[PDB]
Design a protein around this motif. Sequence first.
Motif, PDB file in Angstrom:
ATOM      1  N   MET A   1      81.720  50.664  46.519  1.00  0.00           N
ATOM      2  CA  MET A   1      80.260  50.647  46.836  1.00  0.00           C
ATOM      3  C   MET A   1      79.469  49.746  45.902  1.00  0.00           C
ATOM      4  O   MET A   1      80.029  49.118  45.002  1.00  0.00           O
ATOM      5  N   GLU A   2      78.157  49.715  46.103  1.00  0.00           N
ATOM      6  CA  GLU A   2      77.344  48.684  45.476  1.00  0.00           C
ATOM      7  C   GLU A   2      76.084  49.299  44.896  1.00  0.00           C
ATOM      8  O   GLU A   2      75.160  49.638  45.628  1.00  0.00           O
ATOM      9  N   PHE A   3      76.066  49.445  43.578  1.00  0.00           N
ATOM     10  CA  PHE A   3      74.965  50.095  42.893  1.00  0.00           C
ATOM     11  C   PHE A   3      73.874  49.073  42.561  1.00  0.00           C
ATOM     12  O   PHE A   3      74.159  48.008  41.997  1.00  0.00           O
ATOM     13  N   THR A   4      72.633  49.377  42.941  1.00  0.00           N
ATOM     14  CA  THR A   4      71.500  48.510  42.592  1.00  0.00           C
ATOM     15  C   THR A   4      70.362  49.367  42.090  1.00  0.00           C
ATOM     16  O   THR A   4      70.367  50.573  42.316  1.00  0.00           O
ATOM     17  N   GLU A   5      69.361  48.751  41.467  1.00  0.00           N
ATOM     18  CA  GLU A   5      68.149  49.479  41.089  1.00  0.00           C
ATOM     19  C   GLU A   5      67.114  49.382  42.191  1.00  0.00           C
ATOM     20  O   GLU A   5      66.760  48.285  42.641  1.00  0.00           O
ATOM     21  N   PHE A   6      66.587  50.524  42.624  1.00  0.00           N
ATOM     22  CA  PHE A   6      65.530  50.450  43.624  1.00  0.00           C
ATOM     23  C   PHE A   6      64.515  51.559  43.439  1.00  0.00           C
ATOM     24  O   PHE A   6      64.784  52.543  42.756  1.00  0.00           O
ATOM     25  N   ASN A   7      63.343  51.365  44.027  1.00  0.00           N
ATOM     26  CA  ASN A   7      62.316  52.391  44.052  1.00  0.00           C
ATOM     27  C   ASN A   7      62.648  53.434  45.132  1.00  0.00           C
ATOM     28  O   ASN A   7      62.703  53.113  46.317  1.00  0.00           O
ATOM     29  N   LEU A   8      62.822  54.683  44.722  1.00  0.00           N
ATOM     30  CA  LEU A   8      63.243  55.722  45.668  1.00  0.00           C
ATOM     31  C   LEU A   8      62.188  56.007  46.742  1.00  0.00           C
ATOM     32  O   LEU A   8      62.530  56.315  47.899  1.00  0.00           O
ATOM     33  N   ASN A   9      60.917  55.940  46.335  1.00  0.00           N
ATOM     34  CA  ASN A   9      59.790  56.197  47.230  1.00  0.00           C
ATOM     35  C   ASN A   9      59.697  55.163  48.336  1.00  0.00           C
ATOM     36  O   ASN A   9      59.387  55.516  49.480  1.00  0.00           O
ATOM     37  N   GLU A  10      60.009  53.906  47.999  1.00  0.00           N
ATOM     38  CA  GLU A  10      60.015  52.804  48.972  1.00  0.00           C
ATOM     39  C   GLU A  10      61.111  53.011  50.015  1.00  0.00           C
ATOM     40  O   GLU A  10      60.915  52.729  51.198  1.00  0.00           O
ATOM     41  N   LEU A  11      62.252  53.525  49.559  1.00  0.00           N
ATOM     42  CA  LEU A  11      63.347  53.864  50.469  1.00  0.00           C
ATOM     43  C   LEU A  11      62.918  55.001  51.375  1.00  0.00           C
ATOM     44  O   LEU A  11      63.142  54.969  52.576  1.00  0.00           O
ATOM     45  N   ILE A  12      62.336  56.047  50.796  1.00  0.00           N
ATOM     46  CA  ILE A  12      61.931  57.187  51.619  1.00  0.00           C
ATOM     47  C   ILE A  12      60.958  56.712  52.707  1.00  0.00           C
ATOM     48  O   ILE A  12      61.112  57.043  53.888  1.00  0.00           O
ATOM     49  N   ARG A  13      59.983  55.881  52.342  1.00  0.00           N
ATOM     50  CA  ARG A  13      59.021  55.436  53.354  1.00  0.00           C
ATOM     51  C   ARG A  13      59.655  54.548  54.434  1.00  0.00           C
ATOM     52  O   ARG A  13      59.266  54.567  55.615  1.00  0.00           O
ATOM     53  N   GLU A  14      60.659  53.787  54.020  1.00  0.00           N
ATOM     54  CA  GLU A  14      61.431  52.919  54.919  1.00  0.00           C
ATOM     55  C   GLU A  14      62.133  53.750  55.997  1.00  0.00           C
ATOM     56  O   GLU A  14      62.137  53.384  57.166  1.00  0.00           O
ATOM     57  N   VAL A  15      62.743  54.853  55.579  1.00  0.00           N
ATOM     58  CA  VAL A  15      63.329  55.806  56.513  1.00  0.00           C
ATOM     59  C   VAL A  15      62.264  56.470  57.395  1.00  0.00           C
ATOM     60  O   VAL A  15      62.474  56.586  58.606  1.00  0.00           O
ATOM     61  N   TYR A  16      61.117  56.864  56.826  1.00  0.00           N
ATOM     62  CA  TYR A  16      60.026  57.401  57.672  1.00  0.00           C
ATOM     63  C   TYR A  16      59.652  56.432  58.808  1.00  0.00           C
ATOM     64  O   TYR A  16      59.507  56.825  59.971  1.00  0.00           O
ATOM     65  N   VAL A  17      59.489  55.160  58.464  1.00  0.00           N
ATOM     66  CA  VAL A  17      59.110  54.154  59.443  1.00  0.00           C
ATOM     67  C   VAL A  17      60.131  54.086  60.575  1.00  0.00           C
ATOM     68  O   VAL A  17      59.764  53.890  61.733  1.00  0.00           O
TER      69      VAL A  17
END
Length: 147
Positions: free
Chosen positions: A1-17
């Motif tokens: 797998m592929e570990f990166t740094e990301f904003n968790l909140n941005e991911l959550i909103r991306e899934v909401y969309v």
Amino acid sequence: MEFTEFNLNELIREVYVLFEEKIRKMNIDFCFETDNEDLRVEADRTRIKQVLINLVQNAIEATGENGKIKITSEDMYTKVRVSVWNSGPPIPEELKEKIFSPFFTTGLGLSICRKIIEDEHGGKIWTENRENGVVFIFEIPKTPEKR
């Protein structure tokens, strides 16, 4: 797998969309609350995204028409916690583990969710009955080195 740094909140909103039009079609009340807008984590973003997609899809199916979904992200000391809550009937005690089986059927993709959260990230995923509904919670360490 592929570990990166990301904003968790941005991911959550991306899934909401991804589910926004569906949530509206079903007249579901959705809310997302976070205690840290700039909450970042080092994780496999694709795999965490898969977990969130499953949990939101399950919440929509569980809560149904006129239902309610709340996502909460929490910045804990060494880990991040995401709670996905829906209004609806409680998970019977006898099924609290069984629902995570690859052979659970009525499935909810939870066996893969647990593999991602627990085995791949060293975290925890579980469920509780709360507030005339059900929460599915996962937490993962902030870094693989905090694991």
